[PDB]
Amino acid sequence: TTHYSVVDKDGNAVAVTYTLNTTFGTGIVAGESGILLNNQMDDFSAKPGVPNVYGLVGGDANAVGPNKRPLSSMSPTIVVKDGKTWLVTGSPGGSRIITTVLQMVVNSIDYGLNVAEATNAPRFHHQWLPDELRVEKGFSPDTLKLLEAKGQKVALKEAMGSTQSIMVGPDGELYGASDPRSVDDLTAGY
Amino acid sequence: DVFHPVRAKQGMVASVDATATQVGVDILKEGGNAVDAAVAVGYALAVTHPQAGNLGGGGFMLIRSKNGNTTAIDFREMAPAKATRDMFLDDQGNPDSKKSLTSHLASGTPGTVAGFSLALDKYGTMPLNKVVQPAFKLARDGFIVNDALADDLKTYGSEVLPNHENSKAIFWKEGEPLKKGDTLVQANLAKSLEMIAENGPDEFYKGTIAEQIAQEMQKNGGLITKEDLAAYKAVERTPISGDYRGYQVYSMPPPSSGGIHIVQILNILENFDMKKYGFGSADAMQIMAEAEKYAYADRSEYLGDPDFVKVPWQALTNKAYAKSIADQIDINKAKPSSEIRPGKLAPYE
Numbered sequence A: 001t002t003h004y005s006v007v008d009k010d011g012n013a014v015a016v017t018y019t020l021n022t023t024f025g026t027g028i029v030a031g032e033s034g035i036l037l038n039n040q041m042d043d044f045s046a047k048p049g050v051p052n053v054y055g056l057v058g059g060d061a062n063a064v065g066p067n068k069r070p071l072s073s074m075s076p077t078i079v080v081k082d083g084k085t086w087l088v089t090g091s092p093g094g095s096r097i098i099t100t101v102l103q104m105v106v107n108s109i110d111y112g113l114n115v116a117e118a119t120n121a122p123r124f125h126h127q128w129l130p131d132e133l134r135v136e137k138g139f140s141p142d143t144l145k146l147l148e149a150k151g152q153k154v155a156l157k158e159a160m161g162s163t164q165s166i167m168v169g170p171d172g173e174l175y176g177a178s179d180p181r182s183v184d185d186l187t188a189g190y
Numbered sequence B: 001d002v003f004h005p006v007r008a009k010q011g012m013v014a015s016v017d018a019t020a021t022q023v024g025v026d027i028l029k030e031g032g033n034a035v036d037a038a039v040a041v042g043y044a045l046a047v048t049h050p051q052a053g054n055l056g057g058g059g060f061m062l063i064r065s066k067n068g069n070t071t072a073i074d075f076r077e078m079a080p081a082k083a084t085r086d087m088f089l090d091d092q093g094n095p096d097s098k099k100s101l102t103s104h105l106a107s108g109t110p111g112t113v114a115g116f117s118l119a120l121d122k123y124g125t126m127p128l129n130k131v132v133q134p135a136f137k138l139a140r141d142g143f144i145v146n147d148a149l150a151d152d153l154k155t156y157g158s159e160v161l162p163n164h165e166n167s168k169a170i171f172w173k174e175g176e177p178l179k180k181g182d183t184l185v186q187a188n189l190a191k192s193l194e195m196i197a198e199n200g201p202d203e204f205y206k207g208t209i210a211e212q213i214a215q216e217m218q219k220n221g222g223l224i225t226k227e228d229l230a231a232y233k234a235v236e237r238t239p240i241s242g243d244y245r246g247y248q249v250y251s252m253p254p255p256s257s258g259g260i261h262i263v264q265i266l267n268i269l270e271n272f273d274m275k276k277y278g279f280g281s282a283d284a285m286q287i288m289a290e291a292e293k294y295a296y297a298d299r300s301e302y303l304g305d306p307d308f309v310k311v312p313w314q315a316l317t318n319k320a321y322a323k324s325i326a327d328q329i330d331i332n333k334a335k336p337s338s339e340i341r342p343g344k345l346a347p348y349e
């Protein structure tokens, strides 16, 4: 999965998240087309109560069915401030897309972080099942001590996500940030 | 500040790949609008970011015009018409992750080409051939493999790409994944791109590309047929949205769960003085972790393709429902997931 964001000179905005599901999908090219084929069917619930590759579970609503669209977590997101497009964001991460984008919003609104600060700040994640507070490197050991004392089951795991974000200032000036977690990416403008 | 945003006065593109970002910036400089550039970036990533940029997958687009009109494009894959409820169970009734992840049965009918053309035709200003041309050139003439692509080919590509002759012919070289500094030319993809540019999206869903997908499936026990490809459609849908401290948040509706649960969690958090706790505080992380639990619990029960099941999106994004969740959160005691079930939505319908 990969997310990108666009804002043009007129103030139009687009946020796109799209995907083969896993990296390279099935790895199967379709014939002589050169096109790799998705493995999106794993986003259905294969059997009620059994997790998929991201640990997500389902039942009847997300069961496999003909012509059905499997449930996604992708969340291209736009936040509006004072009536105007203000933050354009999104991210890969399967189940963690929801919490990564959430943290971008909270970081921007509640903590007043600029779009690069919001992007480079560390991330945490809890998805009900499995029952664990997933964290990235970068949280204080003092803070992690308090969470475990509260009963959180802290689990240090791989870096989460790749936000690619644009914030629109009041004068219409643009501010952008690519994720440190992804190399060879770029935010650029003119 | 320790961290500084990139700054621009006119237009801006942010993407996972430097080449695709520059493609989008160039389209803006040539006079394309944000939708034009977004479609050009999506086609360029289908060449330079084969990990995830794609023609053979799907996704979602959120568009907000300068005039405030906000809309969502659903170009999520559709399961084949021959897909069945238990198609991924083994003979014992247990899900087989190999069937849903690495076999030809793993694929849904791709929607990316349909979604980009729906957006381009209605909200763009350039012809498809013009926004596909940068990708076409990258496929035909090649580009240098960078660290990101080399690393992904070695780590993730090694598990699947060399197991299919046509994939191995493109992404492997001298028995190894393409290395950093090698040149990746994709002549077949260039032909596919050239045909889409000339004949439009029906090349993918009804033309030579569709035949190539259908034969690949028919030869290897897959299910996508030409009827599937001819019946696919992208769908414009109303965004899911909420209000958080006077900011409005727009995101994807079902068949995505994202918008619902982002709005639901924000609704829960709105009951707490998050600013006062501050980033990286145990209190803020406690409250967010607890709120997230209830949403993912709801996700497992209520979310699916809205054309097949009624999603109670009003109740899930209802602030009184969120308030009933916030009152359960103990800032000093986490509640085990074993004690969390999907919420009772009836009083909020």
Ligand SMILES: *[P@@](=O)(CC[C@H](N)C(=O)O)O[C@H](CC)C(=O)NCC(=O)O
Residues within 6 Å of the ligand: A001, A002, A019, A020, A021, A022, A023, A040, A043, A071, A072, A073, A074, A091, A092, A093, A094, A095, A097, A159, A160, A161, A162
């Ligand atoms: P995407 O985020 C999978 C998206 C789901 N299919 C969906 O539609 O919800 O996959 C990437 C690549 C495997 C990922 O999971 N992680 C990269 C990251 O950003 O952490």
Ligand SMILES: [Ca+2]
Residues within 6 Å of the ligand: A178, A179, A180, A181, A182, A183, A184, A185
């Ligand atoms: Ca980066």
